[PDB]
Amino acid sequence: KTFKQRRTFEQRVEDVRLIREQHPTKIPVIIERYKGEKQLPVLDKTKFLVPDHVNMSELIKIIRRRLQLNANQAFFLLVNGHSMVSVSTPISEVYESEKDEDGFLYMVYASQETF
């Protein structure tokens, strides 16, 4: 079901190495619905190439636009399994501290803060 489950550590590593060589200015992001989630829809895809200059506040806005949410639907975004300390951090900086050993940046969303 989940991305890590579908692809071998070997395959996730190689894909990240390709994105480096074909989309060098992009952060390779895995974005996934919380397995519990009842309310929000599933995304049309899993793997996103995010411009390395957008901050986390703008990435939340992008995903809310991609889910076509409305103003008063709740949305929470975990990064590397935990809460974002700050939405104003640039995704280039977030990547350098929160990336996985395979080289993706893993995110999970829900309507509840309690995942």
| Site residues for ligand RWP per CB under 6 A | 48-51, 62, 66
Q: What does 50 interact with, of Cl ion, ligand RWP, none (CB < 5 to 8 A by kind)?
A: ligand RWP
SS3 state of residue 114: coil
Considering beta carbons, is residue 5 or 22 the nearer one to Cl ion? 22
Stretch that binds Cl ion, among 1-9, 22-30, 65-73, 94-102 (CB under 5 A): 22-30
Among 23, 64, 66, 99, binds Cl ion (CB under 5 A): 23
* CA–CA separation, 2 and 96 (whole Å): 23
Q: CA–CA separation, 62 vs 10, rounded Å?
A: 30
CB of 89 within 8 A of CB of 54? no
